[PDB]
Amino acid sequence: GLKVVAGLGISGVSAVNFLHEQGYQVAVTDSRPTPPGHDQIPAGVKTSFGQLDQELLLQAEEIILSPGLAPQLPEIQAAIAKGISVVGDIQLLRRATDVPIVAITGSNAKSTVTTLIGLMAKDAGKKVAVGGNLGRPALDLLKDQPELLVLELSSFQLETTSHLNAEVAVVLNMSEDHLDRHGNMLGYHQAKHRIFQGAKKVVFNRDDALSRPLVPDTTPMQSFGLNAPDLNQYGVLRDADGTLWLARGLQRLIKSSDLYIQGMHNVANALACLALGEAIGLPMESMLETLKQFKGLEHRCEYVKTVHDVRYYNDSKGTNVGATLAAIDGLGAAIEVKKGKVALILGGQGKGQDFGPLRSSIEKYAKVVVLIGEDAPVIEQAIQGATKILHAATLKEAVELCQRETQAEDVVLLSPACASFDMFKSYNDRGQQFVACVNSLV
Numbered sequence: 264g265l266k267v268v269a270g271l272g273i274s275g276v277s278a279v280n281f282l283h284e285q286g287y288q289v290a291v292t293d294s295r296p297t298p299p300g301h302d303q304i305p306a307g308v309k310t311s312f313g314q315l316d317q318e319l320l321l322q323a324e325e326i327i328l329s330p331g332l333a334p335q336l337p338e339i340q341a342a343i344a345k346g347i348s349v350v351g352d353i354q355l356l357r358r359a360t361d362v363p364i365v366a367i368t369g370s371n372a373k374s375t376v377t378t379l380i381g382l383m384a385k386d387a388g389k390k391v392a393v394g395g396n397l398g399r400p401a402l403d404l405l406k407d408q409p410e411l412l413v414l415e416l417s418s419f420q421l422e423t424t425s426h427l428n429a430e431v432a433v434v435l436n437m438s439e440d441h442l443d444r445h446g447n448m449l450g451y452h453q454a455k456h457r458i459f460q461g462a463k464k465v466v467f468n469r470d471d472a473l474s475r476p477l478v479p480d481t482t483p484m485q486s487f488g489l490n491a492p493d494l495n496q497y498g499v500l501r502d503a504d505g506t507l508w509l510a511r512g513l514q515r516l517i518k519s520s521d522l523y524i525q526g527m528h529n530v531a532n533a534l535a536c537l538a539l540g541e542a543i544g545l546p547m548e549s550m551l552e553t554l555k556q557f558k559g560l561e562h563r564c565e566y567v568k569t570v571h572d573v574r575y576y577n578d579s580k581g582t583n584v585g586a587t588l589a590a591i592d593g594l595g596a597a598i599e600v601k602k603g604k605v606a607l608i609l610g611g612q613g614k615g616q617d618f619g620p621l622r623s624s625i626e627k628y629a630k631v632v633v634l635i636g637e638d639a640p641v642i643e644q645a646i647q648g649a650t651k652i653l654h655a656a657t658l659k660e661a662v663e664l665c666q667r668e669t670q671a672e673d674v675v676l677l678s679p680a681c682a683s684f685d686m687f688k689s690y691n692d693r694g695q696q697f698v699a700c701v702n703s704l705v
């Protein structure tokens with residue numbers, strides 16, 4: 264019947280155009296007055312902008328809900344109570360193609376892992392299409408007739424997805440995020456674990472209790488973790504002298520020091536990609552060549568510059584406590600033998616997070632924390648006593664204070680554990696500004 268797209272934006276434009284091409288009657292509604300993508304819709308599509316049209320939504324045979332709109336909205340609740348199907352664009356993609364899907368979610372590392380396994384598949388000779396994130400709408404991936412899809416899927420997208428029937432699926436990790444929408448970790452975990460509906464194979468993280476799914480006994484499962492792996496699992500092996508290798512069972516695969524991506528969380532990301540690749544048949548020799556060359560993504564605990572024998576790291580995309588914990592632990596362990604310590608810049612919009620999990624790593628590895636942003640007082644209350652705490656009113660002042668506090672073999676880390684919008688346009692803006700500050704140090 265009538266398909267009603269609820270919420271425009273990039274994915275909403277993708278859904279309207281896809282449904283129109285396939286010969287459906289499509290209407291669209293959005294609360295914003297003139298929504299992004301107004302100029303990108305075909306004329307003749309009925310549009311009800313300015314108000315989320317409750318009457319139009321109740322006229323629908325099916326509603327295609329933007330991931331930016333909660334199913335809990337009262338207008339959407341009224342439709343669900345009438346029995347109207349509410350799905351997202353990922354559901355449209357699933358119906359449109361039979362090709363194998365590699366499905367990836369998790370609180371952190373989704374884009375890093377999605378990019379890497381996509382590169383592993385491409386380098387191995389697969390006609391792969393990679394997307395699902397903002398700006399890579401999943402329906403547009405059908406255009407080039409790929410033989411394989413690699414989808415980065417958010418908890419919001421998974422909430423409205425059923426019977427994904429992935430060739431292989433993974434929840435990489437979970438930590439506190441997106442509770443403004445999901446309410447609590449219960450709702451959040453349930454949303455992500457929809458990625459396993461009909462999954463043909465499962466990869467899971469041995470070291471994260473919220474990764475392993477409940478699936479039928481016939482469903483093959485393979486795990487990764489940061490310990491010596493069991494037979495046919497992924498993990499780490501240490502030589503007698505301590506040298507760390509990525510490994511599968513008893514076989515050593517590649518030294519972690521031979522990767523460009525650093526820190527045990529990136530070792531785990533690489534191992535997850537090897538397991539995803541094994542599930543779709545990629546040869547190990549090819550996967551390791553891809554892995555050796557992979558540089559990691561911008562603003563993901565990224566090396567910027569060395570100034571006076573102190574290395575500076577941009578982790579502006581560390582927008583939650585779990586990401587920042589990984590950054591502190593990774594740099595702290597890396598410099599421990601040379602007796603270096605971390606000077607950490609923390610703060611911004613804290614989103615009501617529990618900052619307690621940072622205390623032990625700050626106490627172990629940090630010589631100073633410089634607090635910025637609107638939730639600096641709440642964060643200070645949580646980390647008081649763990650190490651020396653300073654305040655700065657601007658990012659530039661924070662970088663200068665960290666420079667003053669550090670000596671050769673220390674590192675300076677911007678890993679805010681917070682959203683950026685109280686002082687910046689985006690985490691990208693915050694990271695670019697950090698790089699500019701570092702480049703202006705003398």
Ligand SMILES: Nc1ncnc2c1ncn2[C@@H]1O[C@H](COP(=O)(O)OP(=O)(O)O)[C@@H](O)[C@H]1O
Pocket residue numbers: 369370371372373374375376436528529531532560562563564578579580581582585586587589590
């Ligand atoms: N396995 C991991 N566990 C925790 N934090 C991680 C992990 N991998 C990367 N991070 C950090 O998480 C943040 C987001 O990384 P990213 O790959 O962009 O994730 P996503 O696409 O899920 O947002 C960055 O601060 C990055 O350094």
Ligand SMILES: [Ca+2]
Pocket residue numbers: 373374396415
């Ligand atoms: Ca992402």
Ligand SMILES: [Cl-]
Pocket residue numbers: 582681682683684689690
């Ligand atoms: Cl942000």
Ligand SMILES: [Mg+2]
Pocket residue numbers: 370440
């Ligand atoms: Mg997220």
